[PDB]
Design a binder for this molecule. Sequence first.
Ligand SMILES: [Zn+2]
Ligand SMILES: [Zn+2]
Length: 60
Amino acid sequence: NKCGACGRTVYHAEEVQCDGRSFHRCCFLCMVCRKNLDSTTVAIHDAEVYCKSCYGKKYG
Ligand SMILES: [Zn+2]
Ligand SMILES: [Zn+2]
């Protein structure tokens, strides 16, 4: 439905599933810091999305 960043239309093509929500395919982010995330990886920790950087550096 709606992305955490914009709130434009994530649907099928322009979404990647990340736990409960999806974000847009390009406009894909850390729910914490908000680094420019994409189809590198992604992570989840607890209730929020951690990106590539803050996941591997906070937790190792
Ligand atoms: Zn978006
Ligand atoms: Zn981050």
